[PDB]
RNA sequence: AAUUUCUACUCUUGUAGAUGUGAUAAGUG
DNA sequence: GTACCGTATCCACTTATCACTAAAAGATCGGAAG
DNA sequence: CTTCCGATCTTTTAGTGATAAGTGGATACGGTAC
């Protein structure tokens, strides 16, 4: 079985640092002489002054493009109410594949292949669709052949001012792919029709002719509205809300008028639709119980209704790469000296430019050590870079069919024959190797035939290519073995990449420094000080272990490439900033799998591991409780105090900038919670914010900084580092501790993440952590006199106890259901007991009064906040006594107080029983905050937090949390009982409270 | 109150935690 | 005192996507042959 | 003088896997009103 060690090295988790970059010597000076800061200054203003423009020339051919659709949709439309009717995976398959084929269709209407289009308008589509991706919309063809679009004198000097500079913008050239692409990412213009605003048409076309066979006197009436605003006036309204119209409102124009028709500007249909249910005639009730309303549309894409500068020192691609073979271009190396660590960029020179090229020195001489960074990048994107998908080969087996030797950036020729041709490029989408081919066809042993030629092929690529013979590729396993290639790249990519490390002379470096062929500075931030005293930041652990050398030795945190300068105009001067990013777990996967099932079945192979109920409170901020497997308490913490340093004070003498310091707080706390973690080996609960609304009094009030602080709770428990750790320990830099899944969308999340569990919010805080009990009457319902009659007769028998002095009232489930909340418990009888108030002392002698509760006045019929107290048990023999009742016998009181049916009498008494059932009682003033069950136990005895009893919660932030762990516990127990090794995804307050009184009654 | 950046302090010209950046699009209150 | 109806959120905040890239391929410029 | 050749710099370009899967709703001070 596995260990809490062994959730390491699962995943690979892509981070970045940042750093001030000092300059050294007079590089600055020479930049000071050189000018380039204005002129990069001037470059990213003319960039984000230049979005707009290309925006325009995106939104006119998309428009243009999608004005001429001329696609049908009831065959997707029969499929999603296939789907809405059924559910079925196979539905949903079907729904999924009709969906993306649609996408596709649209697409080949993008890129100019489909058939409903002249072939010579499809050639002119296509050869667009080519063009907008590429460097000939600087002054191209683009804007020559698309005629639609005048662009002033000013517009063409600043789109020629990017003369060989179009890189400058291609991560932005790919994010307008993503426009464009038709692979279901919601930024897509594909996903945006066929999956996101198609539903909404389909339902408002069923909705309307179901409108219509419920009554058709507003159709004419409809009418007269599409008269009222005049849009769409050749056409109908049926034949508006039908599918042939959705060949129509492709447009953002079309969009914003078939909205405004519903919504107005002058009448809309909806304000009409409100104005007929207003009248609240028959024909108004049989519309008001059908849906009467019409969703809008969702508008188009890229359609319209301190700072600091990128660097790139007039040269592109600036740092993308720090290979030594592109270091010739991208001019960016870095340098280590005595622990100092050093950034090094060649400016291109006069005209061209000029390399620099410094020879190695021994290691015994003085100078810098400069990193040698050997990365051939990831298989997939780069096997087929070379050998297949050369313009020649391609070229060649158009025309022959022979194998072809090449030799050129070779150490040894490689031969390639038509079949590994076919295998890559099988002219389908499924390739013979790809997994999606033995889904669809299920032919096994030509996918492996597939596989193990493509793996031989590669290998020897690998053997014969000449930045990879140098490298050793026996740790492979043999090649018929591998029962996936995703596995085989994932084995193979961390096989290609290495950094040595050779000393370079400091005369050299300082000579290129002293002419400005060089620039030089220093990575900087606050733990590189000489006046460093303390335990450094966790970028700084990430980067000292970067360079670490039995880092160097095995690689488990990579340096990426993709770094980026800024210019800052701490604010004092102007400051450099380096952004570099990292990946952690470089060994791992690129992706998490089975992450939960893992996670599951150590749960069920450790059952004894605790429980920490996180929680949040009213007077503390954050409330922590540790349980074991039997429920029984093991530790209660108050989060106010985080390092000596009260936060609660803070936030009430600064409350008469709140949000930052909310997210230092959460920050110095989930510190604390991954300590507990990480010392019980346990899970952690939190509750689950979409399903309540509640604590408008806890600190921590509003969803949103609770939400984002579950973000940064499972950011910081994806990769988990410690400061005391050592490096090759589990847990330290090099080996980190994943727990939890990647963040993808709080709603697709589901309940469980790793070891971090979910649970809904209510019945957590005011319930018995003896008996479980709650009160079962909603009190809004209480208003009129005789509704408090069938409150008191609802009640079974009331009795004065002469023993203890007590009241014991007697109440069961199955009576009294006009009041009683729809939420019936395990047992169908309960016992009150209305407890004599008398002294006590705590566990360390602190005198209280038992049984005390608090109410709020009401002036006005409105509450006021002055929380009275009061004397349950006091008022109920005043009362009693009031008119004289005779007690002490023990018989049935409640038809005696019954029968004189006094309304004063039962409006006191009601008042009463909600200060008995009353579950919490605090009140800030004079600091109470306690729990009294007015209920005994099994054990024959109420509970009462003020007895400051370890067993139990001090307080009803520690129940809260302590019903919070037992949640977790129970959606533990169905893990055990569970034979999937999954959850239930969800309990409801009807099971949670079954399950809390069978097993604490 | 000194920070790649943020929070909280000043035994220490500093300290304790957290810290995926850049770009784009959409939705909501 | 029992229905009951609407107000306070208006610039910010939250969800999706992708790049974390050497090297081929193509444009560009300076020098030599008819 | 005009044209064809190789160095040199900018762009673009290759693409793997593997399931989640369909998941439920929810008001609140407060004030004014018959």
Redesign the pocket.
Known sequence: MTQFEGFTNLYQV???????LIPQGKTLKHIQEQGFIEEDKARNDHY?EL?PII?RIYKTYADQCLQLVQLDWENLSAAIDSYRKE???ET?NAL?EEQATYRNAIHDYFIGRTDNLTDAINKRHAEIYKGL????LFNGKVLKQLGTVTTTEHENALLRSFD?????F??????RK??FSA?????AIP?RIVQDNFPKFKENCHIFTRLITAVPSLREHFENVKKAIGIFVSTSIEEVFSFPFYNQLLTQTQIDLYNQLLGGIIKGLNEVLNLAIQKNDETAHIIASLPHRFIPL??????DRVEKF?LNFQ???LA????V??EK??GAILFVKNGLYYLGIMP?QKG??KALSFEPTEKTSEGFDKMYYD????A???I???ST????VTAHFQTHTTPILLS??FIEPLEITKEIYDL??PEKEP?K????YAKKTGDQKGYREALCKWIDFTRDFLSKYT?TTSIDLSSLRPSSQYK???EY??ELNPLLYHISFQRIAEKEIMDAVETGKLYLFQI????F???????????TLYWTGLFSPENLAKTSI?L???A?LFYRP?FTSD?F?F?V?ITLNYQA???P?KFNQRVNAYLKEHPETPIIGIDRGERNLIYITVIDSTGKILEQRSLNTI?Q?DYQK?LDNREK?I???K???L??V??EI?DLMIHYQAVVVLENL????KS?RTGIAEK?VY??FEK?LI??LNCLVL?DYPAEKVGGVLNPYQLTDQF?????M?TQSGFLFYVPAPYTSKIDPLTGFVDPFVWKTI???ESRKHFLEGFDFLHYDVKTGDFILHFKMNRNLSFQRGLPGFMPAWDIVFEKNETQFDAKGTPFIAGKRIVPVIE???FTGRYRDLYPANELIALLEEKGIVFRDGSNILPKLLENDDSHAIDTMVALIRSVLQMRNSNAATGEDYINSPVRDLNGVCFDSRFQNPEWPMDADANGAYHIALKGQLLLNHLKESKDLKLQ??ISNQDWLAYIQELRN
């Not at 190797?433 to 999606?436: G, I, K, L, N, V």
């Not at 900087?524 to 733990?527: E, L």
Request: hydrophobic content about 25%.
């Open positions: 892509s981070k970045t640092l940042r750093f001030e984000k979005k925006d559910k079925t995976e949903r999924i991706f590429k460097a000939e060989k500079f179009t890189t400058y291609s991560g932005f050239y790919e994010n993503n426009v692979e279901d990412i919601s930024t996903h969702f508008k188009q894409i890229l359609s990128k040269m592109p691609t993308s790469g720090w290979d073979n592109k271009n991208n291109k061209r430019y990365y051939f990048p990831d997939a994107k780069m087929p870079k070379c998908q050369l313009k020649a050129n950036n890559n490029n390739k190797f790809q997994t999606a930045k996936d290639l995703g790249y994932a900087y931030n606050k733990d000080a000489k006046g460093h005293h303390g335990k450094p930041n966790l970028h990579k990426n490439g993709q980026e701490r400051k900033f952004h990013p996967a690129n992706s799998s390092q340093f803070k900038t949000k930052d310091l997210q230092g707080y920050s110095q989930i510190h991954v979409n399903f309540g609304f408008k949103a939400q984002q940064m950011d910081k400061k993808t969308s709080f709603a697709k589901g208003k009129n006199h006005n019929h409105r995804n969800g």
